[PDB]
Write a protein that binds this ligand. Structure first.
Ligand SMILES: C/C=C\NC(=O)[C@H]1NC(=O)[C@H](CC(N)=O)NC(=O)[C@@H](NC(=O)C(=O)[C@H](C)CC)Cc2ccc(O)c(c2)-c2cccc3c2NC(=O)[C@@]3(O)[C@@H]1O
Ligand SMILES: [Mg+2]
Lengths: 243, 249, 212, 239, 232, 222, 233, 246
């Protein structure tokens, strides 16, 4: 009866690929660009809003950058709703780890939980996978500052600097050309902004199409989500714009 | 037996969720609705496209109340919007008020309804909702807010926007007419103008619905004696008030 | 019921009685209280008759399954822990059992475990379980020595069971003896207490309290 | 193929997946059993796919119980669950009845799982392995059974399954008699295996085993199998 | 055929269930068996089939209860499943009601069991035909069951390959064998002749013949091997 | 407050000789201080020359007997009509009883028959399944009255050879069927004399290599 | 049921040469109150079985419903339901007994004592007993409650053994049943003078008599009883 | 809920999903395992493509199942994590119920059974992973190396390779591995491993990752500098062979 209508989302191609995984990766490539850069004294996240309109309240708008806990943030590329579902589950897992061990959750543990959720969705249930790619930026007392990435395939990796979404190839090439192991957080901000301005498909980079975040260091980390005026100031300061 | 346990919304090779795009298309063919946020209130408005003149248009409401401080309007398929408003009211009561004793803020209610709609695009044996929603709400710590929710489960905060048939022209007119210093009556006037643009037939208090999230109306509370309990901020305008404001368009 | 098991230079000595009672009524005196789990593992029961018999036979079945799966004899530790986890899963349900799992393996050597329905699992060298465990314990600990000969250790186990059968009213019938060595268990006969008592009294100059 | 159900009938009156699993077994390795009044003999082709593969880790002859042995042919991975269920069945019948389970009863219990597939809980596909179950009981003496994923089982005086099963079966039909001895059955299994094997049969790419009433089910070590191979070589050289 | 033979839940434009017919064809490609009853006895004669000469002969007669048995034609696993269900039903009858299950009610239960599978998505209809002999409080009874869910009581019938010869032999011999009351051997010989009326390039041997008898003074008993040599 | 158990009295006895077994039982079914029936047998033939009796609670005894008969039917169905060995029957009955280890059959169980070597055998079960093969065993109300008599007259306990200075026991010997019938009749007459739950009638099942036969004797009805 | 509420008292029955007889009063007692008069406790099933029930009246009515449903279900697809495949007394018993033992083992029994009496198809007299404990036994005379203590001793003097059954006639058995009913009305506080009596005879079929009364009672001697000992007037 | 039979038989006797999982294995990075006289070496290939990857946090190809058993894989990384987690859970369970760490054969058999169940269950696809499990049995010095495939088949190997270009490495091993004389020292085993990898890992030691397992739970991952030393020695011996021909 209902067999005729099953897309069978979790089956292998003759080559050995997952159809829905590749198609979701394509859909994400068609989404906004997000860039994470890890420095010796902090981590920086930048993202381009694809939703662009002069009547869009950019103040109460967070479509690319979300907070998991107080030590971990995520940059999103793809369907925002699936992203928020996974972010809610991730926050719940972080708080459960906290309640269990009375210590903040290590970043890789949360990343692996989310990646295993994705993989389970790419192996059983006959449901569509999550069309979302995540860039995690966090700090733990074990590995210090950490930058991870995960895709709908359920695979996750680590990076010094990484990009997801659209035009990731040119962004990665530029980052590898301009990255240095001893750079600071302001250098990371400059590099992320230059890469976004050089790999943008719009006229020019402006504050109304940007989301920015910095995890900095006292023995306490500061998770600063940039506001529109702060974004405009950091744009005009780094030389991308002038006013 | 619901053997449809598999996803009905999958990714096409072009990186497209077909059912989501088709729901958005069905939304585009829906009657025009709009919302405008002012400095002291928000306004939502839409056209009352009746099926037959024998049918009583007041019995069917396109503008519905979610919470005493949060109202909603839509564009697309009526029945989906009706079941969605029912689910939204029940979720606002369960997942918040029965826990904190207060009604949820606008952003959280919008997030709950967006989760509901997202589940339609991934769960088994179901199609996405064929509606787009404009939710106008007010909470104490965020003030007034206007949000738009699409069938994809995504939501956006808008200073002012519109959805439906004349969506593009309406949005352009609102971009050309809106500013960050409008009062509630100015927003009502701009909404009436945009609707008069996006309508061809009659335009009177009996053919359009319009509601406001403005000040508290204690006369609509139904009980006195609690100073901390003020009236609701959501109020649908009567046909008389609509016609009075139309007489000065 | 009285059962004892102790390891010494010559391997392991195991000795049980054969009396089963239902109150003051001795239901039987032909009860075999050593269950031959396999040619290398013995199980001594005390307490719930059906409980002990049934679950030690099930333990033997599980050990055979383990041998089929892993192509190797099951260790005394693992064999005892299987029954231990079983009785702990049945804890508080009304099971009353106290057993000794005794074996000789190449990995562990001679090994004796005590396992009760309370979930206790103890590896030990000298164990006595049952209503007459006290008399056994007494005679054993008074005449025990690691340097006992096979003959002397078998005789000591027999004599401890005999004392426990004489004093304790709920233990009697006949003594069942076993010697566990590298090659497995060896049965050393069924000795009726009625005649064994007189033999030991005449040959040892003990049991002077009885008229005879 | 995927346009129909897994338990769909063909117009000829057969189950598609069953026939396809039968083909999968045809592409499997060789397994030959011969039952005589002195015991049953099972021999399998190991078929090591590389010289670096340790041929010892090829267990295509397993022990169900001291009186029942089993040889597999085809997708040996599927056989795992069957072997487990068989061993469990044997020990359970012992625990419930204080006796050894009949060979035919064990084979029937194994076959009862074959068609337990489809869409309480069923597996997705039928098994992709065939079994030769040899044993001895006091009712019907020595017995050899062939068990297929078709749910049906037969009793053979001698049976070959896998690649070459046709010619092997023919030669068995030509070389079998009721007065066959145990050594004769061993040498016959060795000869048929050496014939149908692409590689020169030695004690490393073939495995022998026997069920006898006295010693039960014993798998021959490499040395005894090599001695039997030398004996068969001398036999064939002088014929 | 195509576009209508994928499921048992799909009706043909002519009003046919193709999977059912495919199971029936699976029956037709099986060994031949015949059943015949009088008023005092009931006999099943089955021709067991072998793979080759080194293989056994697949059993075809199954005992359900001391008063009722059946012969199979087609899929052996489905036959075993149905016979086990019938054993369970007779056992439940005897235990709860101290009552011998009527053959007619057994046929009803089998019909409903098959109809269950011939209407639900997932799962296949059974692939075996059955011939049931039984002696109940109303005398001797012979039933023919098809996995379509159709069971019919007859004085005699046959299923399997070339069953038409045996069926016509019984159609002619009815007036003769309906009167063989109180003589088992004569009914056994009539059944052997009926099954021989369906042989092509084959001869009955002790290895390939199975007999089943039930009756007033005879519990359901099966004869194989030398026991059947008296009828060949 | 509802008590799910009851006592119907009764007494059963089992003896095993050289090539035979005997299982006897009183036919008196009672309840409290009243008689329910004077002929309600509780020693049943189950087939395969195996006689069984579960004495005590009549409901539980009947349930256990019916379950064992069903088990024998299914054992014939599922194992090519293989004859059920007496030890196999004992193990299966142990499992039947232990199935309700926490709601036991308030019955003492005794089965009798011939072993694989053709010799007489009896097996006894407590209400939870602890089974043992013995040569004589009495169960039920008058069990405590008959068991010592059995130990004295069947296993020759406390009986030494005269004049041997109490050193040579009486040579244990197999009894004839007539002698065990006499012993059963005497045991049941004594039970009827001293126990109020025993009497009315004694029914004896004799299992030999030729099958099962019945002998009925009258008992006092006081 | 955990404790009975409305209850019926004894039920008596006995065999004779050509059949069986059963009888029971028509009283439903709410403890010590004789609440309901005219309560039939004899349920005729078919033309060959009668079921006499004592105990909880609600469970008795539940068993009545079960018997009616059993008759209806046996009628289904059965062209011989009025003949060779009709409901025999033994079938009805075995079914009720299975039900009773199951309800006991589930700790929610049917607080009843049941006596099934009838004639089989071959003329044999069937008479058996079951209760809330599921205990089953069969005797030439069967009674429940006080009857088991008082009715049986009188009825057993007519048929103390099986061999006495061919000698007893219908008149003898019916007179004995009526005498036992009278004795129960004498010495049972929860009894009634009005009762019902069924006769299942292998030749005349089912004879069911209702609205019977205990007659020929001796009460005159009560005039000579004065005081509890020393009192003279 | 979802029980669609994804792994079914084809008319020629093939379960396509299993074969496609094997192909997915053939598309993953290369992995190799070699047995010495008293050590086992596992080598793995890192994707040179990625350069900005920080190896301090990125998961390694060799994962510890217990203190004495390691597992390398080729294929999909997420399915590998699933199998590794299940294997660790089963190892701890066997420790808990047997008071003895699992044997390499037993852990390998458990993983193979998991994969086989995933090839015969409804609503699930097989694992796109092939595994090499290595270690030493408890209180035993004999090396242990096993391989499992998506189909559920497992087998022991003196030396083996899985993943892309595994044919070339298997040829190199079948040529340069003498069963009679296995690498007696750990250095010889590591050198053979690095050579087998260099036959396909064209880039350099940065992409090669070596781990060594030694009895009594001695598992140590080699640093990139030691791997670079080995590659340098192998290149110097290769150039010496090039010069000796002259
Ligand atoms: C040889 C091994 C131990 N040797 C014994 O001799 C032991 N006896 C028994 O197990 C007898 C066997 C028999 N044939 O009589 N079982 C019962 O009686 C039964 N109990 C009864 O209440 C009944 O009958 C009920 C009517 C029906 C269950 C079964 C039972 C139930 C719960 C128990 O917690 C025990 C036994 C129990 C446990 C620990 C120690 C002892 C026990 N019971 C005792 O009597 C003893 O104390 C003695 O140690
Ligand atoms: Mg008496």
């Amino acid at each position: 009866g209902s067999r005729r209508y099953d897309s069978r989302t979790t089956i292998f191609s003759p080559e050995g690929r997952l159809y829905q995984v590749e198609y979701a990766l394509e859909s994400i490539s068609h989404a906004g660009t997000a860039i994470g850069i890890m420095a010796s004294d902090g981590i920086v996240l930048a993202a381009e809003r694809k939703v662009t309109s002069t009547l869009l309240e950019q103040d109460t708008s967070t479509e690319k950058l979300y907070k998991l806990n107080d030590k971990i943030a995520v940059a999103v590329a793809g369907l925002t709703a699936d992203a928020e579902i996974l972010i809610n589950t991730a926050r719940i897992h972080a708080q459960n780890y906290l309640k269990t061990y009375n210590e903040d959750i290590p970043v890789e543990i949360l990343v692996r939980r989310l990646s295993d959720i994705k993989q389970g969705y790419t192996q059983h249930g006959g449901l569509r996978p999550f069309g979302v790619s995540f860039i995690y930026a966090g700090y733990d007392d074990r590995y210090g500052y950490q930058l991870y990435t995960s895709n709908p395939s359920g695979n996750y990796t680590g990076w010094k600097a990484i990009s997801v979404g659209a035009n990731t190839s040119a962004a990665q090439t530029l980052l590898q050309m301009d990255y240095k192991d001893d750079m600071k957080v302001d250098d990371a901000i400059e590099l992320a902004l230059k890469t976004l301005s050089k790999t943008t498909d719009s006229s020019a980079l402006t504050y109304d199409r940007l989301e920015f975040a910095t995890i900095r260091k006292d023995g306490e980390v500061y998770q600063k989500i940039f506001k529109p005026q702060e974004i405009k100031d950091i744009l005009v300061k780094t030389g991308i714009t002038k006013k | 037996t619901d053997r449809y346990s598999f996803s009905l919304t999958t990714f096409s090779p072009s990186g497209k969720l077909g059912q989501i795009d088709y729901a958005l298309t069905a939304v585009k063919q829906g009657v025009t609705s709009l919302g405008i946020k002012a400095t002291n209130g928000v306004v939502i408005a839409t056209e009352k496209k009746s099926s037959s003149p024998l049918a009583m248009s007041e019995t069917l409401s396109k503008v519905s109340l979610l919470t005493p401080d949060i109202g909603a309007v839509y564009s697309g398929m009526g029945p989906d919007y009706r079941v969605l408003v029912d689910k939204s009211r029940k979720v606002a009561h369960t997942s918040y008020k029965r826990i904190y004793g207060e009604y949820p803020p606008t952003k959280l209610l919008v997030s709950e309804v967006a989760k509901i709609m997202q589940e339609a695009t991934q769960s088994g044996g179901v199609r996405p909702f064929g509606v787009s929603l404009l939710i106008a709400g007010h909470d104490e710590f965020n003030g007034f807010s206007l949000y738009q929710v699409d069938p994809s489960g995504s939501y956006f905060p808008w200073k002012a926007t519109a959805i439906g048939k004349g969506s593009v022209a309406a949005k352009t007119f609102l971009e050309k007419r809106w500013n960050d210093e409008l009062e509630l009556e100015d927003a009502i006037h701009i909404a009436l103008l945009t609707l008069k643009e996006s309508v061809e037939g009659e335009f009177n208090g009996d053919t359009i619905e319009l509601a406001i999230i403005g000040d508290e109306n204690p006369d609509l509370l139904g009980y006195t004696g609690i100073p901390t309990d003020k009236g609701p901020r959501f109020r649908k305008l009567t046909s008389q008030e609509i016609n009075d404001r139309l007489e000065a368009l | 019921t009285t059962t004892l098991a102790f390891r010494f230079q010559g391997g392991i000595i195991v000795a049980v009685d054969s009396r089963a009672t239902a109150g003051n009524w001795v239901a039987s005196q032909t009860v075999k209280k050593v269950i031959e789990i396999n040619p290398f593992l013995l199980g001594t029961m005390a307490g719930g008759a059906a409980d002990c018999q049934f679950w030690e036979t099930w333990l033997g079945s599980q050990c055979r399954l383990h041998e089929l799966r892993e192509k190797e004899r099951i260790s005394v530790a693992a064999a005892s822990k299987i029954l231990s986890n079983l009785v702990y899963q049945y804890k508080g349900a009304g099971l009353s059992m106290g057993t000794m799992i005794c074996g000789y393996t190449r990995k562990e050597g001679p090994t004796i475990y005590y396992v009760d329905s309370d979930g206790t699992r103890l590896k030990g060298d000298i164990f006595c379980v049952g209503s007459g465990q006290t008399f056994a314990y007494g005679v054993l600990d008074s005449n025990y020595k690691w340097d006992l000969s096979v003959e002397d250790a078998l005789y000591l186990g027999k004599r401890s069971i005999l004392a426990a059968a004489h004093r304790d009213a709920y233990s009697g019938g006949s003594v069942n003896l076993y010697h566990v060595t590298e090659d497995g268990w060896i049965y050393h006969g069924n000795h009726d207490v009625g005649e064994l008592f007189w033999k030991v009294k005449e040959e040892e100059g003990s049991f002077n309290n009885v008229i005879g | 193929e995927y346009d129909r159900g897994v338990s769909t009938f063909s117009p000829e009156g057969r189950l598609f997946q069953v026939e396809y699993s039968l083909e999968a077994i045809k592409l499997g390795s060789t397994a030959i059993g011969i039952a005589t009044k002195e015991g049953v003999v099972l021999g399998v082709e190991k078929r090591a796919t590389s010289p670096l593969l340790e041929s010892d880790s090829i267990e295509k002859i397993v022990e169900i119980d001291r009186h029942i042995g089993c040889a597999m042919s085809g997708l040996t991975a599927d056989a795992r669950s069957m072997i487990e269920h068989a061993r469990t069945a044997a020990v359970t019948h012992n625990l419930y009845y204080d006796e050894d389970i009949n060979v035919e009863s064990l084979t029937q219990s194994v076959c009862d799982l074959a068609l337990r597939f489809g869409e309480e809980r069923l597996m997705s596909r039928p098994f992709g392995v065939a079994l030769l179950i040899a044993g001895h009981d006091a009712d019907d003496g020595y017995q050899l059974f062939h068990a297929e994923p078709s749910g049906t089982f037969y009793r053979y005086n001698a049976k070959a399954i896998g690649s070459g099963s046709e010619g092997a079966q023919a030669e068995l039909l030509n070389e079998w008699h009721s007065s066959l001895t145990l050594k004769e059955a061993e040498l016959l299994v060795l000869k048929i295996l050496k014939q149908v094997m692409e590689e020169k049969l030695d004690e490393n790419n073939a495995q022998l085993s026997c069920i006898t009433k006295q010693d039960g089910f014993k798998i021959y070590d490499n040395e005894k199998t090599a001695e039997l191979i030398k004996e068969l070589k001398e036999k064939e050289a002088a014929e | 055929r195509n576009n209508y033979d994928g499921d048992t839940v799909t009706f043909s434009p002519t009003g046919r269930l193709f999977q059912v017919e495919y199971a029936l064809e699976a029956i037709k490609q099986g060994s031949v068996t015949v059943g015949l009853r009088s008023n005092t006895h009931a006999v099943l004669v089955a021709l067991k089939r072998n793979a080759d000469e080194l293989s056994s002969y697949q059993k075809k007669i199954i005992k359900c209860d001391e008063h009722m048995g059946l012969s199979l034609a087609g899929l052996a696993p489905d036959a075993r499943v149905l016979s086990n269900y019938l054993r369970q039903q007779c056992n439940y009858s005897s235990l709860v009601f101290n009552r011998k299950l009527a053959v007619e009610r057994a046929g009803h239960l089998l019909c409903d069991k098959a109809q269950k599978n011939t209407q639900s998505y997932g799962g296949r209809p059974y692939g075996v035909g059955l011939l049931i002999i039984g002696y109940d409080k109303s005398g001797a009874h012979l039933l023919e069951f098809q996995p379509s869910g159709n069971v019919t009581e007859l004085y005699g019938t046959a299923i399997g390959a070339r069953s038409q010869g045996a069926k016509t032999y019984l159609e002619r011999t009815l007036d003769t064998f309906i009167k063989i009351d109180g003589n088992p051997d004569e009914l056994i010989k009539a059944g052997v002749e009926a099954i021989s009326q369906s042989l092509r390039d084959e001869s009955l041997t002790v290895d390939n013949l199975s007999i089943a008898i039930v009756g007033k003074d005879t519990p359901f008993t099966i004869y194989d091997g030398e026991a059947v040599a008296k009828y060949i | 407050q509802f008590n799910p158990y009851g006592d119907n009295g009764g007494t059963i006895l089992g003896i095993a000789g050289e090539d035979f077994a005997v299982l006897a039982g009183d036919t008196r079914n009672i309840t409290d201080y009243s008689i329910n029936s004077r002929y309600e047998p509780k020693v049943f033939d189950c087939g395969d020359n195996i006689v069984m009796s579960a004495n005590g609670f009549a409901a539980d005894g009947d349930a256990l007997v019916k379950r064992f008969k069903n088990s024998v039917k299914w054992y014939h169905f599922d194992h090519n009509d293989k004859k059920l060995s007496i030890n196999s029957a004992a193990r299966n009955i142990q499992h039947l009883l232990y199935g309700k280890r926490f709601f036991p059959y308030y019955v003492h169980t005794i089965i009798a028959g011939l072993d694989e070597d053709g010799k007489g055998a009896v097996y006894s079960f407590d209400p939870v399944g602890s089974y043992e093969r013995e040569q004589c065993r009495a169960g039920g109300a008058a069990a405590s009255l008959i068991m010592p008599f059995l130990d004295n007259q069947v296993n020759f306990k406390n009986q030494y050879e005269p004049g041997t200075n109490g050193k040579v026991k009486k040579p244990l010997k197999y009894l004839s069927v007539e002698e065990v019938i006499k012993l059963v009749r005497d045991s049941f007459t004594s039970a009827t004399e001293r126990h109020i739950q025993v009497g009315d009638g004694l029914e004896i099942l004799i299992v030999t290599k030729d099958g099962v036969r019945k002998e009925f004797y009258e008992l006092k009805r006081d | 049921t955990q404790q009975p509420i409305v209850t019926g008292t004894s039920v008596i029955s006995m065999k004779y040469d050509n059949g069986v007889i059963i009888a029971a009063d028509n009283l439903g007692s709410y403890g010590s109150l004789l609440r309901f008069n005219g309560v039939e406790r004899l349920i005729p099933v078919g033309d060959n079985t009668v079921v006499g029930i004592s105990g909880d009246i609600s469970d008795m009515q539940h068993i009545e419903r079960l018997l009616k449903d059993l008759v209806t279900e046996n009628a289904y697809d059965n062209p011989l339901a009025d003949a060779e495949e009709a409901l025999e007394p033994s079938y009805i018993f075995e079914y009720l007994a299975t039900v009773m033992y199951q309800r006991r083992s589930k700790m929610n029994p049917l607080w009843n004592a049941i006596i099934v009496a009838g004639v089989q198809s071959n003329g044999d007299q069937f008479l058996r007993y079951v209760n809330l404990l599921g205990v089953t036994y069969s005797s030439p005379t069967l009674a429940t409650g006080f009857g088991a203590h008082m009715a049986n001793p009188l009825l057993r003097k007519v048929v103390d053994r099986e061999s006495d059954i061919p000698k007893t006639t219908v008149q003898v058995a019916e007179e004995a049943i009526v005498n036992a009913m009278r004795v129960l009305y004498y010495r049972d506080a929860r009894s009634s003078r009005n009762f019902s009596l069924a006769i299942i005879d292998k030749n005349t079929g089912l004879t069911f008599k209702k609205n019977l009364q205990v007659e020929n009672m001796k009460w005159d001697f009560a005039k000579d009883i004065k005081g509890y000992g020393t009192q003279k007037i | 809920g979802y029980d669609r039979a994804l792994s079914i038989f084809s008319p020629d006797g093939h379960i396509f999903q299993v074969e496609y999982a094997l192909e997915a294995v053939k598309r993953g990075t290369c992995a190799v395992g070699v047995k010495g006289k008293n050590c086992v070496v596992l080598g793995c290939e890192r994707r040179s493509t990625l350069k900005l990857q920080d190896t301090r946090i990125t998961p390694s190809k060799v994962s510890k199942i217990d203190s004495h058993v390691v597992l390398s894989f080729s294929g999909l990384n997420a399915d590998s994590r699933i199998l590794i987690e299940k294997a660790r859970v089963e190892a701890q369970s066997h420790r808990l119920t047997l008071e003895d760490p699992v044997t390499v054969e037993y852990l390998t058999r458990y993983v193979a059974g998991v994969q086989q169940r995933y090839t015969q269950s409804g609503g699930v696809r097989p694992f796109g992973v092939s595994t090499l499990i290595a270690g030493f049995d408890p209180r035993d010095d004999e090396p242990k190396l096993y391989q499992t495939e998506p189909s559920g088949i497992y087998s022991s190997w003196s030396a083996q390779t899985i993943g892309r270009n595994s044919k070339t490495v298997r040829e190199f091993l079948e040529k340069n591995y003498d069963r009679k004389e296995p690498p007696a020292t750990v250095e010889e085993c590591v050198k053979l491993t690095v050579r087998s990898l260099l036959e396909v890992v064209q880039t350099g030691a940065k992409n090669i990752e070596i781990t060594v397992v030694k009895p009594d739970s001695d598992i140590v991952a080699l640093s990139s500098e030691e791997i670079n030393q080995y590659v340098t020695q192998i290149e110097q011996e290769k150039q010496e062979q090039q010069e000796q021909d002259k």
